[PDB]
């Protein structure tokens, strides 16, 4: 059963933890308690393939270690998350794409642009802007809300499909 190492990055408070909890959270006992802080495992079925998702969250600074810094760049695919009511968070997305590519020394890194908090009335970033940016990167753009669960699954599953397309 294929594993997929997924990393969730973006500015403070855009909802990176919220989207991950909403994707994992159910009404069972949490099937895994990973001992690596801010990691999350969950099995799913995407397009038929029964897959295990190891999801690394952006950790708090109390979790810093040189090894964690190394481990995070081995992620196979990255969610670039911004909040649609937070302009700076969208304006800094390009830094995330640029530097992830740099630290992985790779020209094709599976990536999905994620615009979150789409339930909020205080929009400051236009859907068209995010679509245009995602186009220029040749990556998908998914609009999400961790509050209403809209697009949460589509975001992570699209990232898995992109990892697949990468490995052919």
């Amino acid at each position: 059963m294929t594993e997929y190492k997924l990393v969730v990055v973006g500015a403070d408070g855009v909802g990176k933890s919220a989207l991950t909890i909403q994707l994992i959270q159910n009404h069972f006992v949490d099937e895994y308690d990973p001992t690596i802080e801010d990691s999350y495992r969950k099995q799913v079925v995407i397009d038929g393939e029964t897959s295990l998702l190891d999801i690394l969250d952006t950790a708090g600074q109390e979790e810093y270690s040189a090894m964690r810094d190394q481990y995070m760049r081995t992620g196979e695919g990255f969610l670039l998350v911004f909040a649609i009511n937070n302009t700076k968070s969208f304006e800094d997305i390009h830094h995330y794409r640029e530097q992830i590519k740099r630290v992985k020394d790779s020209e094709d890194v599976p990536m999905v642009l994620v615009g979150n908090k789409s339930d909020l009335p205080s929009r400051t970033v236009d859907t068209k802007q995010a679509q245009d940016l995602a186009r220029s990167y040749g990556i998908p753009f998914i609009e999400t809300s961790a509050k209403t669960r809209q697009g949460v699954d589509d975001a992570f599953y699209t990232l898995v499909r992109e990892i697949r397309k990468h490995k052919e």
Partner: protein, 91 residues
């Protein structure tokens, strides 16, 4: 070290500065650079630099003015920012 160190003006014109610092060990997605009159009468100006650089150009300053320049590192894999390092420079 988790904080950028050794912030300095490397080169200057009467109205612009080329600043340099040393990167921290923690991986940086971008540096946040702010600059303003040391007094503080006016709001600070701010821009971002890619995490792979440790220099930047500040242009459009006023000559003979005391400026406070401040650098923050935004960690790539961790929430929040480094502590700031700052310097004063008089154009």
């Amino acid at each position: 070290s988790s904080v950028p160190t050794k912030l300095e003006v490397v080169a200057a014109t009467p109205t612009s500065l080329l600043i340099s610092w040393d990167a921290p060990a923690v991986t940086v997605v971008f540096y946040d650079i702010t600059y303003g009159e040391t007094g503080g009468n006016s709001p600070v100006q701010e821009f971002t630099v890619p995490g792979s650089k440790s220099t930047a150009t500040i242009s459009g300053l006023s000559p003979g003015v005391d400026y406070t320049i401040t650098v923050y590192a935004k960690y790539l894999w961790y929430s929040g920012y480094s502590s700031p390092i700052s310097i004063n420079y008089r154009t």
